[PDB]
């Protein structure tokens, strides 16, 4: 089974620059049957290059593929705004076809610190026996950010979930939402609830907190 490995995982470049994506095969891809696909959020994948270098009609001229054997390359001569998406390579030279794990091409912009907000559980929710505390990390770059929950200055672990938005089309920033979930019982067992945010645009970890019932 031929294993395709794409590199890098994430490619951070500014618009107008030249993007080069790599697809490495574990063994030789017969007859150069290697394809590149683009996929945007909420959409089906789109064929960009087939036969390692051939390009279907309707596909922009800035997309070109090259390589043979085990080393293939997708080249975007000039990165347009709509080019920032996920790209997959695919071999179909055997009956058993496989995809690469994919490469994300994101817009590189100036580092931006996250605006941090914290939300206590509403009185309506507490009425149902559970408590969800939401920490918001608004409009930041780069995507890598760390969120730590502190209940009475005690580091929490395994009781929170987070999700990140797609990179914004206007300011190219990211937003993160961390939700700490407790039972109303365990929520009333403590007083101080804090979310600690560590980022690169931050010289020191930012902490937003509240006291239960204030």
């Amino acid at each position: 089974e031929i294993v395709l490995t794409q590199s890098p995982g994430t490619q951070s470049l500014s618009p107008g620059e030249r993007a080069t994506l790599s697809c490495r095969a574990s063994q030789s891809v017969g007859n150069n049957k290697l394809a590149w696909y683009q996929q945007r959020p909420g959409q089906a994948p789109r064929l960009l290059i087939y036969g390692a270098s051939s390009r279907p009609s309707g596909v922009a001229d800035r997309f070109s593929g090259s390589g043979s054997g085990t080393d293939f390359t997708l080249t975007i001569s000039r990165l347009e705004p709509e080019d920032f998406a996920v790209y997959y390579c695919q071999q179909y030279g055997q009956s058993l076809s496989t995809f690469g794990q994919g490469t994300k091409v994101e817009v590189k912009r100036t580092v931006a610190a996250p605006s941090v907000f914290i939300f206590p559980p509403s009185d309506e929710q507490l009425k149902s026996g559970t408590a969800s505390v939401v920490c918001l990390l608004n409009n930041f770059y780069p995507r890598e950010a760390k969120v730590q929950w502190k209940v009475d200055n005690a580091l929490q672990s395994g009781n929170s979930q987070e999700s990140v938005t797609e990179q914004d089309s206007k300011d190219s920033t990211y937003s993160l939402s961390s939700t700490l979930t407790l039972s109303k019982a365990d929520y009333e067992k403590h007083k101080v609830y804090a979310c600690e945010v560590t980022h690169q645009g931050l010289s020191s970890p930012v902490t937003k907190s509240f006291n239960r019932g204030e």
């Binding site: 089974e1 049957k33 394809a35 696909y37 996929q39 089906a44 994948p45 789109r46 064929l47 087939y50 036969g51 051939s54 279907p56 997959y88 695919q90 179909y92 009956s95 058993l96 076809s97 496989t98 995809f99 690469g100 794990q101 994919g102 605006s115 907000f117 914290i118 939300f119 206590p120 559980p121 509403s122 309506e124 929710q125 149902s128 969800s132 939401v134 918001l136 608004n138 979930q161 987070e162 999700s163 990140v164 938005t165 937003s175 939402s177 939700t179 979930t181 204030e214």
Partner: protein, 230 residues
């Protein structure tokens, strides 16, 4: 131009079997390879198998070998994917894809690569029951910077299955809105947050209502978010 239309979203329980259809319209059905590709939420593409209708030759991926069945019906120009013994990790969007060609008809020339894709079909496998979400307010802080920026929103909690759409003020408020991807809680229910940043000066005058829509449960909820009266 070739058009692939798949069947609607499916909700199944563990151990059951689902059948997704892919009706082809346009071009030639019998001579071109029809494949099935799935994609788990936030994950990559995964080739499941393919078939050339006219040859009745099916090729499966080893991971699905034994629980998967792919068929092509030349009488209706429709391909089928059948996946048995469903488990929660089978939850994904299932795409149908056909190889592209240079020319029309049977004497068309195949390129192998997937040039044509269906709209995709969400198959959710869980023990959970279809449930509309509870919408709780993420109230604006009473410590909001006077003159600066305030954040508020709604917590769309405990629903099944995906998806949920959220808008603000019936589509009137779009600037600064962030609807986060849903996470699958340990209870088997989904949950997401939709926030928006607004001027702090508007907090006591402007009305903010999040419009939560959950088509799978026929639930539509409008929640008003206001500062808390502390």
């Amino acid at each position: 131009q070739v058009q692939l239309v798949q069947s609607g979203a499916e909700v199944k329980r563990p151990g059951s079997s689902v059948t997704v259809s892919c009706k082809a319209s346009g071009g030639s059905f019998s001579t071109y390879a029809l494949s099935w590709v799935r994609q788990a939420p936030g994950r990559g593409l995964e080739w499941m198998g393919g078939v050339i209708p006219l040859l009745t030759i099916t090729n499966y991926a080893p991971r699905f070998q034994g629980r998967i069945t792919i068929t092509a019906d030349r009488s209706t120009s429709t391909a089928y994917l059948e996946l048995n013994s469903l488990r929660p990790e089978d939850t994904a969007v299932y795409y149908c894809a056909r190889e592209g060609t240079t020319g029309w008809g049977w004497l068309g020339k195949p390129i192998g690569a997937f040039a044509h894709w269906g709209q995709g079909t969400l198959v959710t496998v869980s023990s959970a029951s279809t449930k509309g979400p509870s919408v709780f307010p993420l109230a604006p802080s009473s410590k909001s910077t006077s003159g600066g920026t305030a954040a508020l929103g709604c917590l769309v909690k405990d629903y099944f299955p995906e998806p949920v759409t959220v808008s603000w003020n019936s589509g009137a408020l779009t600037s600064g809105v962030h609807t986060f991807p849903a996470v699958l809680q340990s209870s088997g229910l989904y949950s997401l947050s939709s926030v928006v940043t607004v001027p702090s000066s508007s907090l006591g005058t402007q009305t903010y209502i999040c419009n939560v829509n959950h088509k799978p449960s026929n639930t539509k909820v409008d929640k008003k978010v206001e500062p808390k009266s502390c």
